[PDB]
Amino acid sequence: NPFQFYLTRVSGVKPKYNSGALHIKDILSPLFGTLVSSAQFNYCFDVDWLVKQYPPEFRKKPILLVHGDKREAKAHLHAQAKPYENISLCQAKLDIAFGTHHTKMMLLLYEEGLRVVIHTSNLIHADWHQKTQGIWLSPLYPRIADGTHKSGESPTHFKADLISYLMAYNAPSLKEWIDVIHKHDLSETNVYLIGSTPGRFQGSQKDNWGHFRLKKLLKDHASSMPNAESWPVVGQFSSVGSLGADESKWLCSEFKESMLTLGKESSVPLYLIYPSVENVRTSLEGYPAGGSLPYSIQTAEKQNWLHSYFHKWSAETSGRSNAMPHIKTYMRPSPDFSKIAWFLVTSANLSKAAWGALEKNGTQLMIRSYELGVLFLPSAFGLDSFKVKQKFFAGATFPVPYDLPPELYGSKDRPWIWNIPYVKAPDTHGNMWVP
Ligand SMILES: O=C(O)c1c[nH]c2c(S(=O)(=O)F)cccc2c1=O
Ligand SMILES: *S(=O)(=O)c1cccc2c(=O)c(C(=O)O)c[nH]c12
Ligand SMILES: *S(=O)(=O)c1cccc2c(=O)c(C(=O)O)c[nH]c12
């Protein structure tokens, strides 16, 4: 398949729903390449678990862990890694308050070439067990031949853009990976990189990151159709940030404005998919899945206007309605949801920290965190749109992993709010939630 977009395997679904899914052990297997060194960009790590996911014959190859931890959190990560002489650590600089390193990426250097994996899962057992997570697998990139005079660049500019993303860390261990990427031919890449890095971006640099990056790509490489105002926007995420006192403060003024861009010329329905309390309670994990669905009561009660946009998690199409989402996706379906104009899988949740918030009279985009995703545009595949994969077939599509159209919350539903108790009905393991 051309998209190379995969879900993680889910323990408990019938085999039909895992056959085209990937476990971390599959990604790292010798069949994917003969590993010589890897970099693991992530947020949370279980180092003992992680090393066991590599094939035994590769467990002593160098591993770089790229993380954002500080102070005692950083001390705990170093303590986890110290038994493994081959593991080095790179602490991503986070010079803006409340910033985090959320990017999930593997750089896998092989004897045969290079592979890039951009995904949504932490490097801990629970994130690959019973959650809905997304994976983009790059091709095996070959080394550029000696005396060849190739850029190795793709029509999507992925090679330069990935190097640009790495340069933002200003890290010597990542300059080593930049030099590796320079040596490889990434020209087959058919996705666009969309990253966020911490900073305050002005002028030209405004288009490099966050939701302005998305807007620029949609302006440059998508075309606007008639009736485009009827094509909804869908956002699907596992955390909700503080968005302001009303939808005009950020959600519909700059976030939706970036996401509704199509083409270069100058009322759109907005669907937000986020697990309800009932979604979480009846999930495979039960209430403990809500430990990975951060939405504070303190934030929620200041933006009740938001919840009228909320739709339940439903994923019959991939057998994953009870596998809570830690994937984040954004897309532009047609009014009947049979086609999409583009699809994005990313780490970025529905938050200003991840996507950026305009400052200084609209002239500066401020981003707190590292985020990373990849954008699927029909034009990159010679197509005008993507047909949508669904559960029902009457009888070759983009594999949207959840059901369309999204289903509105019922009047008795509530968004999952992780730091209040739920003691009225037990979860699938027989337990309540008392935070
Ligand atoms: O964008 C995001 O998804 C998030 C960003 N920050 C968080 C923090 S914070 O202490 O770093 F402000 C604490 C808890 C959850 C989140 C979160 O979910
Ligand atoms: S390469 O095969 O070594 C090659 C072949 C033709 C021309 C050049 C060239 O002009 C340069 C340069 O630095 O300008 C390098 N390699 C070339
Ligand atoms: S961290 O950014 O402070 C943090 C802490 C707990 C849980 C999460 C979380 O679930 C996510 C997510 O994308 O779901 C991100 N950061 C977290």
CSV table of C-alpha atoms and ligand atoms in Angstrom, one decimal:
chain,number,residue,atom,x,y,z
A,1,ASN,CA,0.0,0.0,0.0
A,2,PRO,CA,1.2,3.5,-0.9
A,3,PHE,CA,0.5,5.3,2.4
A,4,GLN,CA,2.5,3.0,4.8
A,5,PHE,CA,0.2,4.1,7.6
A,6,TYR,CA,-0.3,1.5,10.3
A,7,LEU,CA,-2.0,0.9,13.6
A,8,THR,CA,-0.3,-0.7,16.5
A,9,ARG,CA,-1.4,-4.2,17.4
A,10,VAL,CA,-4.1,-4.5,20.1
A,11,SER,CA,-4.2,-7.4,22.5
A,12,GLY,CA,-7.7,-8.7,22.5
A,13,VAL,CA,-9.1,-7.9,19.1
A,14,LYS,CA,-9.7,-10.7,16.6
A,15,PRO,CA,-6.8,-11.5,14.3
A,16,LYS,CA,-8.6,-9.8,11.4
A,17,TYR,CA,-8.0,-6.5,13.1
A,18,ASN,CA,-4.2,-7.1,13.8
A,19,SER,CA,-3.2,-8.7,10.5
A,20,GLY,CA,-2.2,-5.3,9.0
A,21,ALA,CA,-1.0,-3.8,12.3
A,22,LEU,CA,2.5,-3.5,13.7
A,23,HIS,CA,4.0,-4.2,17.1
A,24,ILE,CA,7.3,-2.5,18.1
A,25,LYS,CA,9.0,-5.9,17.9
A,26,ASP,CA,7.9,-6.0,14.2
A,27,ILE,CA,9.4,-2.6,13.5
A,28,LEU,CA,12.7,-3.5,15.0
A,29,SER,CA,13.0,-7.0,13.6
A,30,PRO,CA,15.9,-8.0,11.4
A,31,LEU,CA,13.5,-8.3,8.5
A,32,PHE,CA,13.1,-4.5,8.5
A,33,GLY,CA,16.9,-4.1,8.3
A,34,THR,CA,20.2,-5.0,9.9
A,35,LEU,CA,20.5,-2.4,12.7
A,36,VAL,CA,23.7,-0.6,13.5
A,37,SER,CA,22.4,2.3,15.5
A,38,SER,CA,19.1,4.0,16.4
A,39,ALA,CA,17.6,7.1,17.9
A,40,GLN,CA,14.4,7.0,19.9
A,41,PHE,CA,12.6,10.3,20.2
A,42,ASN,CA,9.9,10.1,22.8
A,43,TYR,CA,8.2,11.5,25.9
A,44,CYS,CA,8.0,8.5,28.3
A,45,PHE,CA,10.4,5.6,28.4
A,46,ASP,CA,10.7,2.2,30.1
A,47,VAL,CA,14.3,1.4,29.2
A,48,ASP,CA,14.3,-2.2,30.4
A,49,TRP,CA,11.2,-2.8,28.3
A,50,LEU,CA,12.5,-0.9,25.3
A,51,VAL,CA,15.8,-2.8,25.1
A,52,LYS,CA,13.8,-6.1,25.2
A,53,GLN,CA,11.9,-5.0,22.1
A,54,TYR,CA,15.0,-5.0,20.0
A,55,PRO,CA,16.1,-8.3,18.6
A,56,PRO,CA,18.6,-10.0,20.9
A,57,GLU,CA,21.4,-9.7,18.2
A,58,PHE,CA,20.8,-5.9,18.1
A,59,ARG,CA,20.5,-5.1,21.8
A,60,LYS,CA,24.1,-3.9,22.1
A,61,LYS,CA,24.0,-1.5,19.2
A,62,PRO,CA,24.1,2.2,20.1
A,63,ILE,CA,20.8,3.8,21.1
A,64,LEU,CA,20.2,7.5,21.6
A,65,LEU,CA,17.2,8.4,23.7
A,66,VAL,CA,15.9,11.9,22.9
A,67,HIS,CA,13.7,13.2,25.7
A,68,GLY,CA,12.6,16.4,27.5
A,69,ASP,CA,13.0,15.5,31.2
A,70,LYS,CA,14.5,17.9,33.7
A,71,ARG,CA,15.8,17.7,37.3
A,72,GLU,CA,14.7,14.6,39.2
A,73,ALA,CA,12.8,13.2,36.2
A,74,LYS,CA,16.0,13.5,34.2
A,75,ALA,CA,17.9,11.8,37.0
A,76,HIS,CA,15.4,8.9,36.9
A,77,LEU,CA,15.8,8.4,33.2
A,78,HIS,CA,19.6,8.3,33.5
A,79,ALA,CA,19.2,5.8,36.3
A,80,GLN,CA,17.1,3.6,34.0
A,81,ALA,CA,19.7,3.8,31.2
A,82,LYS,CA,22.9,3.4,33.2
A,83,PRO,CA,22.9,-0.4,33.2
A,84,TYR,CA,23.1,-0.3,29.4
A,85,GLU,CA,26.5,0.9,28.3
A,86,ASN,CA,25.3,1.4,24.7
A,87,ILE,CA,22.5,3.9,25.6
A,88,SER,CA,23.2,7.6,25.3
A,89,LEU,CA,20.8,10.4,26.2
A,90,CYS,CA,20.0,13.8,24.5
A,91,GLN,CA,18.0,16.2,26.6
A,92,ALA,CA,15.9,18.4,24.3
A,93,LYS,CA,16.1,22.1,25.4
A,94,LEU,CA,12.8,23.4,26.7
A,95,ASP,CA,13.4,27.1,27.2
A,96,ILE,CA,9.7,28.1,27.3
A,97,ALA,CA,7.7,27.4,30.4
A,98,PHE,CA,5.4,24.3,30.4
A,99,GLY,CA,7.0,22.9,27.2
A,100,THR,CA,7.4,19.2,26.7
A,101,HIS,CA,9.1,16.9,24.3
A,102,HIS,CA,6.2,14.9,22.8
A,103,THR,CA,7.7,13.9,19.4
A,104,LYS,CA,7.6,10.2,18.8
A,105,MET,CA,10.2,9.2,16.1
A,106,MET,CA,12.6,6.3,15.4
A,107,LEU,CA,15.7,6.9,13.3
A,108,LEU,CA,16.9,3.4,12.4
A,109,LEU,CA,20.3,3.2,10.7
A,110,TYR,CA,20.9,-0.2,8.9
A,111,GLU,CA,23.7,-1.8,7.0
A,112,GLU,CA,21.3,-1.5,4.0
A,113,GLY,CA,20.2,2.1,4.5
A,114,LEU,CA,18.1,4.3,6.7
A,115,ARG,CA,14.5,4.2,7.9
A,116,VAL,CA,12.4,6.9,9.7
A,117,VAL,CA,9.4,6.0,11.8
A,118,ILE,CA,7.0,8.7,13.0
A,119,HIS,CA,4.4,7.4,15.4
A,120,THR,CA,2.3,8.2,18.4
A,121,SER,CA,3.3,5.7,21.2
A,122,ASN,CA,5.4,6.2,24.2
A,123,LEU,CA,8.1,3.5,24.8
A,124,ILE,CA,6.3,1.8,27.6
A,125,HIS,CA,4.3,-1.5,27.6
A,126,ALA,CA,0.9,0.0,28.0
A,127,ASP,CA,1.1,2.2,24.9
A,128,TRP,CA,1.5,-0.8,22.6
A,129,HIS,CA,-0.9,-3.1,24.4
A,130,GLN,CA,-4.6,-2.0,24.2
A,131,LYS,CA,-4.5,1.5,22.7
A,132,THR,CA,-5.3,2.9,19.3
A,133,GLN,CA,-1.9,4.3,18.1
A,134,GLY,CA,-0.7,5.3,14.6
A,135,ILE,CA,2.6,4.6,12.7
A,136,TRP,CA,4.1,6.0,9.5
A,137,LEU,CA,6.8,3.8,8.1
A,138,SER,CA,9.2,5.4,5.7
A,139,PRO,CA,10.7,3.4,2.8
A,140,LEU,CA,14.2,1.9,3.2
A,141,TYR,CA,16.3,4.9,2.1
A,142,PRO,CA,19.5,3.8,0.3
A,143,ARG,CA,22.8,5.5,0.8
A,144,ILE,CA,23.7,7.9,-2.0
A,145,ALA,CA,26.3,6.4,-4.2
A,146,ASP,CA,29.9,7.8,-4.3
A,147,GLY,CA,30.4,10.4,-7.0
A,148,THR,CA,26.7,10.6,-7.6
A,149,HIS,CA,25.5,14.2,-7.4
A,150,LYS,CA,22.1,13.7,-5.9
A,151,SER,CA,20.3,15.8,-3.3
A,152,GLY,CA,18.4,12.8,-2.2
A,153,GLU,CA,15.4,15.2,-1.8
A,154,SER,CA,11.8,14.3,-2.4
A,155,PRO,CA,9.1,16.5,-4.1
A,156,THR,CA,7.7,16.9,-0.6
A,157,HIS,CA,11.1,18.4,0.7
A,158,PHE,CA,11.0,15.8,3.5
A,159,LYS,CA,14.8,15.4,3.7
A,160,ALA,CA,15.5,19.1,4.2
A,161,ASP,CA,12.5,19.5,6.5
A,162,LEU,CA,13.6,16.6,8.7
A,163,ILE,CA,17.1,18.0,8.9
A,164,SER,CA,15.5,21.4,9.7
A,165,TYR,CA,13.5,19.8,12.5
A,166,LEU,CA,16.7,18.2,13.9
A,167,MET,CA,18.7,21.4,13.7
A,168,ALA,CA,16.3,23.1,16.1
A,169,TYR,CA,17.6,21.0,19.0
A,170,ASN,CA,21.1,22.4,18.6
A,171,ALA,CA,22.4,19.1,19.9
A,172,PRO,CA,25.7,17.4,18.9
A,173,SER,CA,24.2,13.9,19.1
A,174,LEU,CA,21.6,15.0,16.6
A,175,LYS,CA,24.1,16.7,14.3
A,176,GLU,CA,25.5,13.1,13.9
A,177,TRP,CA,22.1,12.0,12.7
A,178,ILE,CA,21.8,15.0,10.4
A,179,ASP,CA,25.1,13.9,8.8
A,180,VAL,CA,23.7,10.4,8.4
A,181,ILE,CA,20.5,11.7,6.7
A,182,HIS,CA,22.6,13.8,4.3
A,183,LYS,CA,24.3,10.5,3.1
A,184,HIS,CA,20.9,8.9,2.3
A,185,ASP,CA,18.5,9.2,-0.6
A,186,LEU,CA,15.1,10.1,0.7
A,187,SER,CA,13.6,11.0,-2.7
A,188,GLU,CA,10.8,8.4,-2.6
A,189,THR,CA,9.2,10.0,0.4
A,190,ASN,CA,5.6,10.9,-0.4
A,191,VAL,CA,4.5,12.6,2.9
A,192,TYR,CA,5.1,16.1,4.2
A,193,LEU,CA,6.7,16.7,7.6
A,194,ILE,CA,4.8,18.9,10.1
A,195,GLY,CA,6.7,19.6,13.2
A,196,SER,CA,6.6,21.9,16.2
A,197,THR,CA,9.6,23.1,18.1
A,198,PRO,CA,9.8,25.6,21.0
A,199,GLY,CA,10.2,29.2,20.1
A,200,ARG,CA,8.8,32.5,18.9
A,201,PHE,CA,8.8,32.6,15.2
A,202,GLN,CA,8.5,35.8,13.1
A,203,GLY,CA,8.5,36.7,9.5
A,204,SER,CA,9.5,33.9,7.2
A,205,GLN,CA,10.1,31.4,10.1
A,206,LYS,CA,6.3,31.7,11.0
A,207,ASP,CA,5.5,29.2,8.2
A,208,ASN,CA,8.1,26.6,9.5
A,209,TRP,CA,6.1,25.1,12.4
A,210,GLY,CA,2.8,24.3,14.0
A,211,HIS,CA,-0.5,25.3,12.5
A,212,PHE,CA,1.1,27.8,10.2
A,213,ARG,CA,3.2,25.0,8.7
A,214,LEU,CA,0.0,23.1,8.0
A,215,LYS,CA,-1.6,26.2,6.5
A,216,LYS,CA,1.3,26.8,4.2
A,217,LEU,CA,1.3,23.2,2.9
A,218,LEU,CA,-2.5,23.3,2.3
A,219,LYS,CA,-2.1,26.7,0.5
A,220,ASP,CA,0.7,25.4,-1.7
A,221,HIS,CA,-0.2,21.7,-2.4
A,222,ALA,CA,-3.9,21.3,-2.0
A,223,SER,CA,-6.6,22.7,-4.3
A,224,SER,CA,-9.9,24.2,-3.1
A,225,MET,CA,-13.1,22.6,-4.6
A,226,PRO,CA,-16.5,24.2,-5.0
A,227,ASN,CA,-18.7,23.8,-1.9
A,228,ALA,CA,-15.5,23.7,0.1
A,229,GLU,CA,-17.3,25.5,3.0
A,230,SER,CA,-19.3,22.3,3.4
A,231,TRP,CA,-16.3,20.1,3.8
A,232,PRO,CA,-16.0,19.6,7.6
A,233,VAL,CA,-12.8,19.6,9.6
A,234,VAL,CA,-12.2,16.7,12.0
A,235,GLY,CA,-9.7,16.7,14.9
A,236,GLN,CA,-9.1,13.6,17.0
A,237,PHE,CA,-6.8,13.8,20.1
A,238,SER,CA,-6.1,12.5,23.6
A,239,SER,CA,-5.7,15.7,25.4
A,240,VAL,CA,-7.4,19.1,25.6
A,241,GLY,CA,-5.5,22.3,26.5
A,242,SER,CA,-6.8,25.6,27.8
A,243,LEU,CA,-8.3,27.2,24.7
A,244,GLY,CA,-9.8,30.4,26.1
A,245,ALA,CA,-13.2,31.8,27.2
A,246,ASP,CA,-14.8,31.2,23.8
A,247,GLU,CA,-14.2,29.7,20.4
A,248,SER,CA,-13.0,33.0,18.9
A,249,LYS,CA,-9.9,33.2,21.2
A,250,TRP,CA,-8.0,30.5,19.3
A,251,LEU,CA,-10.0,27.5,18.2
A,252,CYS,CA,-12.0,29.0,15.3
A,253,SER,CA,-9.9,32.2,14.9
A,254,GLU,CA,-6.5,30.8,14.1
A,255,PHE,CA,-6.6,27.0,14.5
A,256,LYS,CA,-9.6,26.4,12.4
A,257,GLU,CA,-8.5,29.1,9.9
A,258,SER,CA,-5.2,27.3,9.3
A,259,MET,CA,-6.9,23.9,9.1
A,260,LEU,CA,-9.6,25.0,6.6
A,261,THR,CA,-7.1,26.4,4.1
A,262,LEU,CA,-7.2,24.9,0.6
A,263,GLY,CA,-5.3,26.4,-2.3
A,264,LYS,CA,-3.9,29.8,-2.9
A,265,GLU,CA,-7.1,31.8,-3.4
A,266,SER,CA,-9.3,33.4,-0.8
A,267,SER,CA,-19.5,28.1,8.4
A,268,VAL,CA,-17.3,25.0,8.1
A,269,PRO,CA,-18.5,22.2,10.5
A,270,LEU,CA,-15.9,21.3,13.1
A,271,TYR,CA,-16.0,17.8,14.6
A,272,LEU,CA,-13.7,17.0,17.6
A,273,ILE,CA,-13.3,13.4,18.6
A,274,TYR,CA,-12.4,12.8,22.3
A,275,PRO,CA,-13.3,9.8,24.5
A,276,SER,CA,-16.4,10.2,26.7
A,277,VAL,CA,-16.4,8.9,30.3
A,278,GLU,CA,-18.4,5.9,29.0
A,279,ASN,CA,-15.8,5.3,26.3
A,280,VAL,CA,-13.1,5.1,28.9
A,281,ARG,CA,-15.1,3.0,31.4
A,282,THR,CA,-16.0,0.3,28.9
A,283,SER,CA,-12.6,0.3,27.3
A,284,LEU,CA,-10.2,-2.7,27.3
A,285,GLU,CA,-8.0,-1.0,29.8
A,286,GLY,CA,-10.9,0.4,31.8
A,287,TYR,CA,-10.6,3.7,33.8
A,288,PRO,CA,-6.7,3.4,33.8
A,289,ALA,CA,-6.8,4.4,30.1
A,290,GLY,CA,-7.8,7.8,31.4
A,291,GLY,CA,-4.3,8.3,32.8
A,292,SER,CA,-3.3,8.9,29.2
A,293,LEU,CA,-6.3,11.2,28.5
A,294,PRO,CA,-5.3,14.4,30.3
A,295,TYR,CA,-8.1,16.9,30.6
A,296,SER,CA,-8.2,18.7,34.0
A,297,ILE,CA,-11.4,19.7,35.6
A,298,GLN,CA,-9.8,23.2,36.3
A,299,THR,CA,-9.4,23.7,32.5
A,300,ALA,CA,-12.7,22.0,31.5
A,301,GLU,CA,-14.9,24.2,33.7
A,302,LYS,CA,-13.5,27.4,32.1
A,303,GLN,CA,-14.5,26.3,28.5
A,304,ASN,CA,-17.8,24.4,28.7
A,305,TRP,CA,-18.5,26.0,25.3
A,306,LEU,CA,-16.1,23.5,23.8
A,307,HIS,CA,-17.9,20.3,24.7
A,308,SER,CA,-20.7,21.0,22.2
A,309,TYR,CA,-18.1,20.1,19.5
A,310,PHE,CA,-17.2,16.7,21.1
A,311,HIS,CA,-17.9,13.4,19.5
A,312,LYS,CA,-17.4,9.9,20.9
A,313,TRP,CA,-14.6,7.6,20.1
A,314,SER,CA,-15.9,4.9,17.7
A,315,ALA,CA,-13.7,2.6,15.6
A,316,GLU,CA,-15.8,-0.4,14.4
A,317,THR,CA,-14.0,-0.1,11.0
A,318,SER,CA,-10.7,-1.2,12.7
A,319,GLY,CA,-12.3,-3.2,15.6
A,320,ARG,CA,-10.9,-0.7,18.0
A,321,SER,CA,-13.9,1.0,19.6
A,322,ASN,CA,-12.7,-0.3,23.0
A,323,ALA,CA,-9.0,0.5,22.4
A,324,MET,CA,-8.7,4.0,23.7
A,325,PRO,CA,-7.0,6.5,21.3
A,326,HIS,CA,-3.5,7.8,21.9
A,327,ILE,CA,-3.2,8.5,18.2
A,328,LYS,CA,-3.9,12.1,17.1
A,329,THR,CA,-5.3,12.7,13.7
A,330,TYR,CA,-6.7,15.7,11.7
A,331,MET,CA,-8.4,15.5,8.3
A,332,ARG,CA,-10.8,17.2,5.9
A,333,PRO,CA,-13.6,15.0,4.7
A,334,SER,CA,-16.2,15.7,2.1
A,335,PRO,CA,-19.8,16.5,3.3
A,336,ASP,CA,-20.8,12.9,3.0
A,337,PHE,CA,-17.5,11.7,4.6
A,338,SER,CA,-16.8,9.4,1.5
A,339,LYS,CA,-13.6,11.3,0.6
A,340,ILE,CA,-10.9,13.3,2.4
A,341,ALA,CA,-8.9,16.2,1.1
A,342,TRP,CA,-5.9,15.3,3.3
A,343,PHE,CA,-5.0,13.4,6.5
A,344,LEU,CA,-2.5,14.2,9.3
A,345,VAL,CA,-1.2,11.8,12.0
A,346,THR,CA,0.8,13.6,14.7
A,347,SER,CA,1.7,13.8,18.4
A,348,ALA,CA,0.0,17.2,18.6
A,349,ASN,CA,-3.1,17.3,20.8
A,350,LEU,CA,-5.8,20.1,20.8
A,351,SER,CA,-3.6,22.7,22.5
A,352,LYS,CA,-1.9,26.0,21.9
A,353,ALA,CA,1.3,24.6,23.4
A,354,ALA,CA,1.5,22.0,20.6
A,355,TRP,CA,0.1,23.9,17.6
A,356,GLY,CA,1.2,27.4,18.4
A,357,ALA,CA,-0.5,30.7,19.4
A,358,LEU,CA,-0.1,34.0,17.7
A,359,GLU,CA,1.5,36.8,19.7
A,360,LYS,CA,2.7,40.4,19.1
A,361,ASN,CA,-0.3,41.6,17.1
A,362,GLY,CA,-0.4,38.5,14.9
A,363,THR,CA,3.2,38.7,13.8
A,364,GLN,CA,4.7,36.0,15.9
A,365,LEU,CA,3.9,32.3,16.5
A,366,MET,CA,4.8,31.0,19.9
A,367,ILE,CA,5.2,27.2,20.4
A,368,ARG,CA,6.1,25.6,23.7
A,369,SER,CA,6.7,22.0,22.8
A,370,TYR,CA,8.3,19.5,20.3
A,371,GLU,CA,5.7,17.8,18.2
A,372,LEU,CA,5.9,15.8,15.0
A,373,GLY,CA,3.5,14.3,12.4
A,374,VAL,CA,3.2,13.6,8.7
A,375,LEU,CA,0.7,14.9,6.2
A,376,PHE,CA,-0.9,12.9,3.4
A,377,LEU,CA,-1.9,15.1,0.5
A,378,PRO,CA,-3.6,13.5,-2.6
A,379,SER,CA,-1.4,15.5,-5.0
A,380,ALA,CA,1.6,13.7,-3.5
A,381,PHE,CA,0.1,10.5,-4.8
A,382,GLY,CA,-1.2,11.7,-8.1
A,383,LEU,CA,-4.7,11.9,-6.8
A,384,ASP,CA,-7.4,14.6,-6.4
A,385,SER,CA,-8.7,13.2,-3.1
A,386,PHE,CA,-8.6,10.0,-1.0
A,387,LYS,CA,-11.5,7.7,-0.9
A,388,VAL,CA,-12.3,6.7,2.7
A,389,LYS,CA,-12.0,3.1,4.1
A,390,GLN,CA,-15.1,2.1,6.1
A,391,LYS,CA,-16.5,-1.0,7.8
A,392,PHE,CA,-19.3,-1.6,5.4
A,393,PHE,CA,-18.6,-2.4,1.8
A,394,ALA,CA,-21.1,-3.3,-1.0
A,395,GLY,CA,-18.6,-5.2,-3.2
A,396,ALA,CA,-8.2,0.9,-2.6
A,397,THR,CA,-8.9,3.6,0.0
A,398,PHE,CA,-7.1,5.6,2.7
A,399,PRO,CA,-7.2,3.7,6.0
A,400,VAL,CA,-9.0,6.1,8.3
A,401,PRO,CA,-8.9,4.2,11.6
A,402,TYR,CA,-12.2,5.3,13.1
A,403,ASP,CA,-15.8,5.5,12.0
A,404,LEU,CA,-17.3,8.3,10.0
A,405,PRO,CA,-19.4,10.4,10.4
A,406,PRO,CA,-18.3,10.9,14.1
A,407,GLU,CA,-21.2,10.5,16.5
A,408,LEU,CA,-22.1,13.4,18.8
A,409,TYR,CA,-22.0,12.9,22.6
A,410,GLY,CA,-25.4,12.0,24.1
A,411,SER,CA,-27.0,14.3,26.6
A,412,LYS,CA,-25.8,12.0,29.4
A,413,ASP,CA,-22.2,11.8,28.0
A,414,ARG,CA,-19.4,13.8,29.5
A,415,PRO,CA,-15.8,14.3,28.3
A,416,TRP,CA,-13.2,12.2,30.1
A,417,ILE,CA,-11.8,14.4,32.8
A,418,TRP,CA,-8.9,12.7,34.4
A,419,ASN,CA,-8.6,14.2,37.9
A,420,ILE,CA,-12.2,13.8,39.2
A,421,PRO,CA,-13.5,10.5,40.6
A,422,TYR,CA,-15.9,8.1,38.8
A,423,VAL,CA,-17.6,5.8,41.3
A,424,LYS,CA,-21.0,5.3,39.9
A,425,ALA,CA,-20.3,2.3,37.6
A,426,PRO,CA,-17.3,0.0,37.5
A,427,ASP,CA,-15.0,-0.5,34.5
A,428,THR,CA,-14.2,-3.7,32.6
A,429,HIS,CA,-11.8,-4.8,35.3
A,430,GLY,CA,-14.4,-4.2,38.1
A,431,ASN,CA,-12.9,-1.0,39.4
A,432,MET,CA,-13.8,2.6,40.1
A,433,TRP,CA,-11.6,5.7,39.5
A,434,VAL,CA,-10.4,7.7,42.5
A,435,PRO,CA,-7.6,10.1,41.6
B,1,LIG,O1,-0.2,19.0,24.9
B,1,LIG,C1,-0.4,18.1,25.7
B,1,LIG,O2,-1.0,17.1,25.4
B,1,LIG,C2,0.0,18.3,27.2
B,1,LIG,C3,0.9,19.3,27.6
B,1,LIG,N1,1.2,19.5,28.9
B,1,LIG,C4,0.7,18.7,29.8
B,1,LIG,C5,1.1,18.9,31.1
B,1,LIG,S1,2.3,20.3,31.5
B,1,LIG,O3,2.7,20.2,32.9
B,1,LIG,O4,3.5,20.1,30.8
B,1,LIG,F1,1.6,21.7,31.2
B,1,LIG,C6,0.6,18.1,32.2
B,1,LIG,C7,-0.3,17.1,31.8
B,1,LIG,C8,-0.7,16.9,30.5
B,1,LIG,C9,-0.2,17.7,29.5
B,1,LIG,C10,-0.5,17.5,28.2
B,1,LIG,O5,-1.3,16.6,27.9
B,2,LIG,S1,31.1,14.3,-9.9
B,2,LIG,O1,30.8,13.1,-10.7
B,2,LIG,O2,32.4,14.1,-9.4
B,2,LIG,C1,31.0,15.8,-11.0
B,2,LIG,C2,30.7,15.7,-12.4
B,2,LIG,C3,30.6,16.8,-13.1
B,2,LIG,C4,30.7,18.1,-12.6
B,2,LIG,C5,31.0,18.2,-11.2
B,2,LIG,C6,31.1,19.5,-10.6
B,2,LIG,O3,31.0,20.4,-11.2
B,2,LIG,C7,31.3,19.5,-9.2
B,2,LIG,C8,31.4,20.9,-8.5
B,2,LIG,O4,31.8,20.9,-7.3
B,2,LIG,O5,31.2,22.0,-9.1
B,2,LIG,C9,31.4,18.4,-8.5
B,2,LIG,N1,31.3,17.2,-9.1
B,2,LIG,C10,31.1,17.1,-10.4
B,3,LIG,S1,3.2,15.4,30.0
B,3,LIG,O1,3.1,16.3,28.8
B,3,LIG,O2,3.1,16.3,31.2
B,3,LIG,C1,1.9,14.2,30.1
B,3,LIG,C2,1.5,13.7,31.3
B,3,LIG,C3,0.5,12.7,31.4
B,3,LIG,C4,-0.1,12.3,30.3
B,3,LIG,C5,0.2,12.8,29.0
B,3,LIG,C6,-0.5,12.4,27.9
B,3,LIG,O3,-1.4,11.6,28.0
B,3,LIG,C7,-0.2,13.0,26.6
B,3,LIG,C8,-0.9,12.5,25.4
B,3,LIG,O4,-0.5,12.9,24.2
B,3,LIG,O5,-1.9,11.8,25.6
B,3,LIG,C9,0.8,13.9,26.6
B,3,LIG,N1,1.5,14.3,27.7
B,3,LIG,C10,1.2,13.8,28.9
